[PDB]
Amino acid sequence: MKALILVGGFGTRLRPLTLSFPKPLVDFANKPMILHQIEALKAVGVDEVVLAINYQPEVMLNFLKDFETKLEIKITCSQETEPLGTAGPLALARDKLLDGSGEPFFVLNSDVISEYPLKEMLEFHKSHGGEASIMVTKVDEPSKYGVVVMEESTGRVEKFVEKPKLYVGNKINAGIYLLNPSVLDKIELRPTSIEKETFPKIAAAQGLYAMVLPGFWMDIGQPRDYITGLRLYLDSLRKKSPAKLTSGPHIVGNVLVDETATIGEGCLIGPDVAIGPGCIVESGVRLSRCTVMRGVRIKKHACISSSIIGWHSTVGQWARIENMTILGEDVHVSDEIYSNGGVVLPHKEIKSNILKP
C-alpha cells in the first residue's frame, strides 16, 4: 500500500523555524511532523511514502536515512520544478504510486495533525466502492475555507463551495485522502488543485465520498494554529493515553516531557507545554502554552508563554517571552530581555527588547 504526503514549499509561514529544517521536519510535540504521519501510515500497511516537495530534498537526506531504518518503511522524494499545487504532484509521482494491484493510495497534508483513523477510512472507502474518499472535519469559521456540500444520508459529495459568505455547512477538507488509481488519470502534469479542479470531476461522476473525522484536527501550517494544534493534541493524549503526559506538583494542565529533558526545582510548567529531548529548564521557570524544541536551555526565573523556542536556543535569566514569539535555531536571548511577539532569525543574539516585526 502506497502513500503520498503533500508538502509543497519549504514553508514560509513557519519562518524562522523552517529556515533551518523544512516543514515536514519541524518538531511538533517532540516529534518531527513527518513521524506523526508515517507512524500512522505504517499502522495500516503502507510500505512506501512519497514526499511531494517543492524544495531540493538533499537537505533532509541524512534524517530520512535513519527514519527509514528505524520505522522500516520506504521514503522517496518527488521534487517539483514549479509549484504543482495539491493535485499536480499526484501526476508527477504517478509512477511511484501505481503498483499494479489497483489498490487505493493515501494522500496527506503534511501540516495536518489528527488521530488518523486510517484503518476506519479503509473500510469506509471500500464499502461505497467510489473513486475517491476524503476526510471531513467541522470548524467554527467555514467562511474562511472551502465547505463540503455532501449528501449526509450517503456521504456522496455534491460540490465544494469556496469561502461561503452565506452558511452552507461547516464541514471542510481535513486533508486526508484515499484515492483509487483511476484518479491519477484525471490530473495533468500542470499546476492543478485537487479540491477545486480534481474533486469537481469526481463529484460529477458521483464517485466522491466524505467521511467525518472522529477526533481533533488542526492544520499547524502557521504559528497561531500550531499552538492551537498542540493543545488539541495534548488533550487527545489526556483522553487516550494519559501515561504519556507528565505529572507532579510543578505541572498544571497537559504537559509532554521528553525523558532526556531536565526540569529544575521550583518551576511551574503548564498548561499545554511540550518540552523536547535534551532541554535544560533551570530552577523557577514559568512555562505555559509554549513549545521548547530539541536542546534549548531556559535559564532561571524566566517566564515563557504562547511562544515557540527553536532548537538549541537559550533564554536568559528573568527574561519575559510572550505573545506568539518565535525564536529560530540557536537564538541566545540575554537576561531580563522582554519579547512581545519577537520573530528572531536563526543564530542571532538578542541583547535588547523586541516586539512584533
Side-chain angles (χ1 to χ4, degrees), residues 223-239 241-252:
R224 278 308 186 185
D225 296 321
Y226 180 99
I227 276 71
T228 314
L230 181 58
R231 180 233 310 157
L232 307 164
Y233 167 87
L234 257 39
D235 196 57
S236 187
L237 295 186
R238 176 60 56 184
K239 301 177 171 182
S241 58
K244 292 179 170 294
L245 298 181
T246 190
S247 61
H250 63 325
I251 303 300
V252 354

PDB file of all heavy atoms in Angstrom, residues 223-252, unseen atoms left out:
ATOM      1  N   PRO A 223       1.845  29.758  12.697  1.00  0.00           N
ATOM      2  CA  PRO A 223       2.192  29.674  14.129  1.00  0.00           C
ATOM      3  C   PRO A 223       0.998  29.702  15.066  1.00  0.00           C
ATOM      4  O   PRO A 223       1.001  28.987  16.075  1.00  0.00           O
ATOM      5  CB  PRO A 223       3.095  30.897  14.338  1.00  0.00           C
ATOM      6  CG  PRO A 223       3.606  31.232  12.982  1.00  0.00           C
ATOM      7  CD  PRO A 223       2.494  30.911  12.049  1.00  0.00           C
ATOM      8  N   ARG A 224      -0.018  30.518  14.776  1.00  0.00           N
ATOM      9  CA  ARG A 224      -1.186  30.576  15.650  1.00  0.00           C
ATOM     10  C   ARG A 224      -1.891  29.229  15.722  1.00  0.00           C
ATOM     11  O   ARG A 224      -2.248  28.760  16.810  1.00  0.00           O
ATOM     12  CB  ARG A 224      -2.145  31.667  15.178  1.00  0.00           C
ATOM     13  CG  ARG A 224      -1.767  33.057  15.647  1.00  0.00           C
ATOM     14  CD  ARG A 224      -1.543  33.078  17.152  1.00  0.00           C
ATOM     15  NE  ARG A 224      -1.322  34.431  17.658  1.00  0.00           N
ATOM     16  CZ  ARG A 224      -1.009  34.717  18.919  1.00  0.00           C
ATOM     17  NH1 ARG A 224      -0.870  33.742  19.809  1.00  0.00           N
ATOM     18  NH2 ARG A 224      -0.828  35.978  19.291  1.00  0.00           N
ATOM     19  N   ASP A 225      -2.095  28.586  14.573  1.00  0.00           N
ATOM     20  CA  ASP A 225      -2.723  27.272  14.576  1.00  0.00           C
ATOM     21  C   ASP A 225      -1.786  26.185  15.086  1.00  0.00           C
ATOM     22  O   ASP A 225      -2.250  25.095  15.438  1.00  0.00           O
ATOM     23  CB  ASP A 225      -3.231  26.937  13.174  1.00  0.00           C
ATOM     24  CG  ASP A 225      -4.330  27.876  12.723  1.00  0.00           C
ATOM     25  OD1 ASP A 225      -5.177  28.240  13.568  1.00  0.00           O
ATOM     26  OD2 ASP A 225      -4.345  28.261  11.532  1.00  0.00           O
ATOM     27  N   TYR A 226      -0.485  26.461  15.147  1.00  0.00           N
ATOM     28  CA  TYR A 226       0.453  25.495  15.711  1.00  0.00           C
ATOM     29  C   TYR A 226       0.236  25.338  17.213  1.00  0.00           C
ATOM     30  O   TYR A 226       0.192  24.215  17.731  1.00  0.00           O
ATOM     31  CB  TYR A 226       1.889  25.932  15.401  1.00  0.00           C
ATOM     32  CG  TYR A 226       2.972  25.018  15.925  1.00  0.00           C
ATOM     33  CD1 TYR A 226       3.584  24.089  15.097  1.00  0.00           C
ATOM     34  CD2 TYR A 226       3.405  25.109  17.241  1.00  0.00           C
ATOM     35  CE1 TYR A 226       4.584  23.257  15.576  1.00  0.00           C
ATOM     36  CE2 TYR A 226       4.398  24.287  17.727  1.00  0.00           C
ATOM     37  CZ  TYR A 226       4.987  23.362  16.894  1.00  0.00           C
ATOM     38  OH  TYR A 226       5.980  22.547  17.391  1.00  0.00           O
ATOM     39  N   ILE A 227       0.103  26.455  17.931  1.00  0.00           N
ATOM     40  CA  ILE A 227      -0.158  26.385  19.366  1.00  0.00           C
ATOM     41  C   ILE A 227      -1.524  25.764  19.626  1.00  0.00           C
ATOM     42  O   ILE A 227      -1.688  24.953  20.547  1.00  0.00           O
ATOM     43  CB  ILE A 227      -0.035  27.781  20.008  1.00  0.00           C
ATOM     44  CG1 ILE A 227       1.425  28.106  20.333  1.00  0.00           C
ATOM     45  CG2 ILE A 227      -0.873  27.874  21.273  1.00  0.00           C
ATOM     46  CD1 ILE A 227       2.296  28.360  19.128  1.00  0.00           C
ATOM     47  N   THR A 228      -2.522  26.124  18.815  1.00  0.00           N
ATOM     48  CA  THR A 228      -3.838  25.511  18.951  1.00  0.00           C
ATOM     49  C   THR A 228      -3.762  24.004  18.749  1.00  0.00           C
ATOM     50  O   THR A 228      -4.351  23.236  19.521  1.00  0.00           O
ATOM     51  CB  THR A 228      -4.816  26.123  17.950  1.00  0.00           C
ATOM     52  OG1 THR A 228      -4.692  27.551  17.965  1.00  0.00           O
ATOM     53  CG2 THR A 228      -6.243  25.734  18.307  1.00  0.00           C
ATOM     54  N   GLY A 229      -3.039  23.563  17.717  1.00  0.00           N
ATOM     55  CA  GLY A 229      -2.931  22.141  17.454  1.00  0.00           C
ATOM     56  C   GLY A 229      -2.228  21.385  18.561  1.00  0.00           C
ATOM     57  O   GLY A 229      -2.537  20.217  18.814  1.00  0.00           O
ATOM     58  N   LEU A 230      -1.279  22.035  19.238  1.00  0.00           N
ATOM     59  CA  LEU A 230      -0.598  21.386  20.351  1.00  0.00           C
ATOM     60  C   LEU A 230      -1.554  21.144  21.512  1.00  0.00           C
ATOM     61  O   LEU A 230      -1.501  20.089  22.154  1.00  0.00           O
ATOM     62  CB  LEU A 230       0.598  22.225  20.798  1.00  0.00           C
ATOM     63  CG  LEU A 230       1.405  21.639  21.959  1.00  0.00           C
ATOM     64  CD1 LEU A 230       1.919  20.253  21.610  1.00  0.00           C
ATOM     65  CD2 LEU A 230       2.552  22.560  22.337  1.00  0.00           C
ATOM     66  N   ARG A 231      -2.439  22.104  21.793  1.00  0.00           N
ATOM     67  CA  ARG A 231      -3.411  21.926  22.868  1.00  0.00           C
ATOM     68  C   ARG A 231      -4.376  20.791  22.552  1.00  0.00           C
ATOM     69  O   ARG A 231      -4.615  19.914  23.390  1.00  0.00           O
ATOM     70  CB  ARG A 231      -4.173  23.227  23.113  1.00  0.00           C
ATOM     71  CG  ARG A 231      -5.219  23.140  24.220  1.00  0.00           C
ATOM     72  CD  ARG A 231      -6.582  23.601  23.732  1.00  0.00           C
ATOM     73  NE  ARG A 231      -6.497  24.888  23.052  1.00  0.00           N
ATOM     74  CZ  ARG A 231      -7.390  25.327  22.173  1.00  0.00           C
ATOM     75  NH1 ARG A 231      -8.438  24.575  21.861  1.00  0.00           N
ATOM     76  NH2 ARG A 231      -7.230  26.514  21.601  1.00  0.00           N
ATOM     77  N   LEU A 232      -4.942  20.794  21.342  1.00  0.00           N
ATOM     78  CA  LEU A 232      -5.853  19.725  20.944  1.00  0.00           C
ATOM     79  C   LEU A 232      -5.161  18.366  20.969  1.00  0.00           C
ATOM     80  O   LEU A 232      -5.758  17.364  21.385  1.00  0.00           O
ATOM     81  CB  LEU A 232      -6.415  20.012  19.554  1.00  0.00           C
ATOM     82  CG  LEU A 232      -7.050  21.389  19.384  1.00  0.00           C
ATOM     83  CD1 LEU A 232      -7.203  21.724  17.912  1.00  0.00           C
ATOM     84  CD2 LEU A 232      -8.391  21.431  20.087  1.00  0.00           C
ATOM     85  N   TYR A 233      -3.899  18.310  20.528  1.00  0.00           N
ATOM     86  CA  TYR A 233      -3.170  17.043  20.527  1.00  0.00           C
ATOM     87  C   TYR A 233      -2.881  16.567  21.945  1.00  0.00           C
ATOM     88  O   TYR A 233      -2.986  15.370  22.235  1.00  0.00           O
ATOM     89  CB  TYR A 233      -1.867  17.182  19.731  1.00  0.00           C
ATOM     90  CG  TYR A 233      -0.894  16.031  19.918  1.00  0.00           C
ATOM     91  CD1 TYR A 233      -0.973  14.884  19.131  1.00  0.00           C
ATOM     92  CD2 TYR A 233       0.109  16.096  20.878  1.00  0.00           C
ATOM     93  CE1 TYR A 233      -0.082  13.835  19.305  1.00  0.00           C
ATOM     94  CE2 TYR A 233       0.994  15.052  21.061  1.00  0.00           C
ATOM     95  CZ  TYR A 233       0.901  13.928  20.273  1.00  0.00           C
ATOM     96  OH  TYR A 233       1.798  12.902  20.466  1.00  0.00           O
ATOM     97  N   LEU A 234      -2.500  17.485  22.838  1.00  0.00           N
ATOM     98  CA  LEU A 234      -2.187  17.098  24.211  1.00  0.00           C
ATOM     99  C   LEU A 234      -3.428  16.617  24.951  1.00  0.00           C
ATOM    100  O   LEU A 234      -3.358  15.668  25.741  1.00  0.00           O
ATOM    101  CB  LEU A 234      -1.539  18.272  24.948  1.00  0.00           C
ATOM    102  CG  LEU A 234      -0.021  18.230  25.158  1.00  0.00           C
ATOM    103  CD1 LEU A 234       0.685  17.667  23.945  1.00  0.00           C
ATOM    104  CD2 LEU A 234       0.510  19.621  25.478  1.00  0.00           C
ATOM    105  N   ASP A 235      -4.572  17.260  24.712  1.00  0.00           N
ATOM    106  CA  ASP A 235      -5.810  16.801  25.332  1.00  0.00           C
ATOM    107  C   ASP A 235      -6.248  15.457  24.768  1.00  0.00           C
ATOM    108  O   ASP A 235      -6.937  14.693  25.454  1.00  0.00           O
ATOM    109  CB  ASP A 235      -6.909  17.849  25.150  1.00  0.00           C
ATOM    110  CG  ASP A 235      -8.091  17.622  26.074  1.00  0.00           C
ATOM    111  OD1 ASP A 235      -7.884  17.570  27.311  1.00  0.00           O
ATOM    112  OD2 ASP A 235      -9.225  17.497  25.564  1.00  0.00           O
ATOM    113  N   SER A 236      -5.862  15.155  23.526  1.00  0.00           N
ATOM    114  CA  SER A 236      -6.098  13.825  22.978  1.00  0.00           C
ATOM    115  C   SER A 236      -5.305  12.770  23.743  1.00  0.00           C
ATOM    116  O   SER A 236      -5.816  11.678  24.013  1.00  0.00           O
ATOM    117  CB  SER A 236      -5.739  13.796  21.493  1.00  0.00           C
ATOM    118  OG  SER A 236      -6.099  12.563  20.904  1.00  0.00           O
ATOM    119  N   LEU A 237      -4.055  13.080  24.099  1.00  0.00           N
ATOM    120  CA  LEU A 237      -3.294  12.186  24.968  1.00  0.00           C
ATOM    121  C   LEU A 237      -3.959  12.056  26.332  1.00  0.00           C
ATOM    122  O   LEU A 237      -3.964  10.973  26.928  1.00  0.00           O
ATOM    123  CB  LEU A 237      -1.856  12.688  25.120  1.00  0.00           C
ATOM    124  CG  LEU A 237      -0.972  12.690  23.869  1.00  0.00           C
ATOM    125  CD1 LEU A 237       0.462  13.086  24.212  1.00  0.00           C
ATOM    126  CD2 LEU A 237      -1.008  11.333  23.191  1.00  0.00           C
ATOM    127  N   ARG A 238      -4.525  13.154  26.843  1.00  0.00           N
ATOM    128  CA  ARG A 238      -5.254  13.095  28.105  1.00  0.00           C
ATOM    129  C   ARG A 238      -6.430  12.133  28.015  1.00  0.00           C
ATOM    130  O   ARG A 238      -6.704  11.383  28.960  1.00  0.00           O
ATOM    131  CB  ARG A 238      -5.729  14.497  28.497  1.00  0.00           C
ATOM    132  CG  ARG A 238      -6.586  14.557  29.756  1.00  0.00           C
ATOM    133  CD  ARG A 238      -5.834  14.024  30.960  1.00  0.00           C
ATOM    134  NE  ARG A 238      -4.569  14.721  31.167  1.00  0.00           N
ATOM    135  CZ  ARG A 238      -3.685  14.399  32.106  1.00  0.00           C
ATOM    136  NH1 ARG A 238      -3.926  13.386  32.929  1.00  0.00           N
ATOM    137  NH2 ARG A 238      -2.557  15.088  32.223  1.00  0.00           N
ATOM    138  N   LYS A 239      -7.128  12.129  26.879  1.00  0.00           N
ATOM    139  CA  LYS A 239      -8.286  11.261  26.714  1.00  0.00           C
ATOM    140  C   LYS A 239      -7.899   9.840  26.315  1.00  0.00           C
ATOM    141  O   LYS A 239      -8.601   8.890  26.677  1.00  0.00           O
ATOM    142  CB  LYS A 239      -9.240  11.854  25.674  1.00  0.00           C
ATOM    143  CG  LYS A 239      -9.764  13.240  26.021  1.00  0.00           C
ATOM    144  CD  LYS A 239     -10.648  13.788  24.905  1.00  0.00           C
ATOM    145  CE  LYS A 239     -11.358  15.068  25.324  1.00  0.00           C
ATOM    146  NZ  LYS A 239     -12.258  15.583  24.250  1.00  0.00           N
ATOM    147  N   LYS A 240      -6.796   9.671  25.582  1.00  0.00           N
ATOM    148  CA  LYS A 240      -6.413   8.371  25.036  1.00  0.00           C
ATOM    149  C   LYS A 240      -5.403   7.639  25.915  1.00  0.00           C
ATOM    150  O   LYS A 240      -5.678   6.533  26.387  1.00  0.00           O
ATOM    151  CB  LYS A 240      -5.858   8.539  23.615  1.00  0.00           C
ATOM    152  N   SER A 241      -4.228   8.229  26.133  1.00  0.00           N
ATOM    153  CA  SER A 241      -3.150   7.583  26.886  1.00  0.00           C
ATOM    154  C   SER A 241      -2.516   8.592  27.831  1.00  0.00           C
ATOM    155  O   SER A 241      -1.465   9.173  27.536  1.00  0.00           O
ATOM    156  CB  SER A 241      -2.105   6.984  25.942  1.00  0.00           C
ATOM    157  OG  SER A 241      -1.557   7.980  25.096  1.00  0.00           O
ATOM    158  N   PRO A 242      -3.132   8.822  28.994  1.00  0.00           N
ATOM    159  CA  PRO A 242      -2.611   9.855  29.907  1.00  0.00           C
ATOM    160  C   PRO A 242      -1.218   9.559  30.438  1.00  0.00           C
ATOM    161  O   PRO A 242      -0.550  10.479  30.923  1.00  0.00           O
ATOM    162  CB  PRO A 242      -3.646   9.876  31.041  1.00  0.00           C
ATOM    163  CG  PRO A 242      -4.875   9.240  30.458  1.00  0.00           C
ATOM    164  CD  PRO A 242      -4.376   8.215  29.493  1.00  0.00           C
ATOM    165  N   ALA A 243      -0.754   8.310  30.356  1.00  0.00           N
ATOM    166  CA  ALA A 243       0.563   7.964  30.877  1.00  0.00           C
ATOM    167  C   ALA A 243       1.683   8.678  30.133  1.00  0.00           C
ATOM    168  O   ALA A 243       2.772   8.852  30.692  1.00  0.00           O
ATOM    169  CB  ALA A 243       0.773   6.448  30.811  1.00  0.00           C
ATOM    170  N   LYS A 244       1.445   9.093  28.886  1.00  0.00           N
ATOM    171  CA  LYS A 244       2.460   9.823  28.140  1.00  0.00           C
ATOM    172  C   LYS A 244       2.583  11.271  28.595  1.00  0.00           C
ATOM    173  O   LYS A 244       3.622  11.897  28.355  1.00  0.00           O
ATOM    174  CB  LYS A 244       2.153   9.767  26.641  1.00  0.00           C
ATOM    175  CG  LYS A 244       2.303   8.385  26.026  1.00  0.00           C
ATOM    176  CD  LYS A 244       1.965   8.398  24.540  1.00  0.00           C
ATOM    177  CE  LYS A 244       2.350   7.086  23.867  1.00  0.00           C
ATOM    178  NZ  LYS A 244       3.828   6.874  23.853  1.00  0.00           N
ATOM    179  N   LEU A 245       1.552  11.812  29.242  1.00  0.00           N
ATOM    180  CA  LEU A 245       1.620  13.157  29.793  1.00  0.00           C
ATOM    181  C   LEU A 245       2.271  13.130  31.168  1.00  0.00           C
ATOM    182  O   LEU A 245       2.060  12.200  31.952  1.00  0.00           O
ATOM    183  CB  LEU A 245       0.223  13.764  29.887  1.00  0.00           C
ATOM    184  CG  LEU A 245      -0.523  13.951  28.567  1.00  0.00           C
ATOM    185  CD1 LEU A 245      -1.890  14.585  28.797  1.00  0.00           C
ATOM    186  CD2 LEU A 245       0.310  14.792  27.620  1.00  0.00           C
ATOM    187  N   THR A 246       3.065  14.157  31.458  1.00  0.00           N
ATOM    188  CA  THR A 246       3.772  14.216  32.726  1.00  0.00           C
ATOM    189  C   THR A 246       2.854  14.740  33.828  1.00  0.00           C
ATOM    190  O   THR A 246       1.761  15.254  33.577  1.00  0.00           O
ATOM    191  CB  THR A 246       5.017  15.097  32.613  1.00  0.00           C
ATOM    192  OG1 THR A 246       5.814  14.960  33.796  1.00  0.00           O
ATOM    193  CG2 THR A 246       4.623  16.546  32.455  1.00  0.00           C
ATOM    194  N   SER A 247       3.315  14.605  35.068  1.00  0.00           N
ATOM    195  CA  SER A 247       2.522  14.989  36.224  1.00  0.00           C
ATOM    196  C   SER A 247       3.450  15.359  37.369  1.00  0.00           C
ATOM    197  O   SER A 247       4.640  15.027  37.366  1.00  0.00           O
ATOM    198  CB  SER A 247       1.570  13.867  36.656  1.00  0.00           C
ATOM    199  OG  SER A 247       2.294  12.706  37.034  1.00  0.00           O
ATOM    200  N   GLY A 248       2.887  16.051  38.355  1.00  0.00           N
ATOM    201  CA  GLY A 248       3.633  16.468  39.515  1.00  0.00           C
ATOM    202  C   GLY A 248       3.137  17.786  40.067  1.00  0.00           C
ATOM    203  O   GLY A 248       2.255  18.434  39.494  1.00  0.00           O
ATOM    204  N   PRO A 249       3.704  18.216  41.198  1.00  0.00           N
ATOM    205  CA  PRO A 249       3.274  19.488  41.796  1.00  0.00           C
ATOM    206  C   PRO A 249       3.650  20.702  40.965  1.00  0.00           C
ATOM    207  O   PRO A 249       3.073  21.777  41.168  1.00  0.00           O
ATOM    208  CB  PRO A 249       3.993  19.494  43.151  1.00  0.00           C
ATOM    209  CG  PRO A 249       5.224  18.677  42.911  1.00  0.00           C
ATOM    210  CD  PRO A 249       4.823  17.602  41.936  1.00  0.00           C
ATOM    211  N   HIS A 250       4.597  20.559  40.041  1.00  0.00           N
ATOM    212  CA  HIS A 250       5.024  21.622  39.143  1.00  0.00           C
ATOM    213  C   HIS A 250       4.282  21.601  37.815  1.00  0.00           C
ATOM    214  O   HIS A 250       4.628  22.371  36.913  1.00  0.00           O
ATOM    215  CB  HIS A 250       6.526  21.510  38.880  1.00  0.00           C
ATOM    216  CG  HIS A 250       6.924  20.246  38.177  1.00  0.00           C
ATOM    217  ND1 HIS A 250       6.299  19.037  38.403  1.00  0.00           N
ATOM    218  CD2 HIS A 250       7.877  20.004  37.246  1.00  0.00           C
ATOM    219  CE1 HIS A 250       6.853  18.106  37.649  1.00  0.00           C
ATOM    220  NE2 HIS A 250       7.814  18.667  36.936  1.00  0.00           N
ATOM    221  N   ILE A 251       3.286  20.734  37.667  1.00  0.00           N
ATOM    222  CA  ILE A 251       2.575  20.547  36.410  1.00  0.00           C
ATOM    223  C   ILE A 251       1.148  21.041  36.584  1.00  0.00           C
ATOM    224  O   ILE A 251       0.447  20.626  37.516  1.00  0.00           O
ATOM    225  CB  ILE A 251       2.586  19.073  35.962  1.00  0.00           C
ATOM    226  CG1 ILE A 251       4.020  18.555  35.830  1.00  0.00           C
ATOM    227  CG2 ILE A 251       1.830  18.908  34.656  1.00  0.00           C
ATOM    228  CD1 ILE A 251       4.864  19.313  34.835  1.00  0.00           C
ATOM    229  N   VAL A 252       0.722  21.930  35.692  1.00  0.00           N
ATOM    230  CA  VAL A 252      -0.679  22.291  35.542  1.00  0.00           C
ATOM    231  C   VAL A 252      -1.083  21.954  34.113  1.00  0.00           C
ATOM    232  O   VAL A 252      -0.298  22.144  33.177  1.00  0.00           O
ATOM    233  CB  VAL A 252      -0.937  23.781  35.880  1.00  0.00           C
ATOM    234  CG1 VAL A 252       0.324  24.440  36.431  1.00  0.00           C
ATOM    235  CG2 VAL A 252      -1.474  24.553  34.678  1.00  0.00           C
TER     236      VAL A 252
END
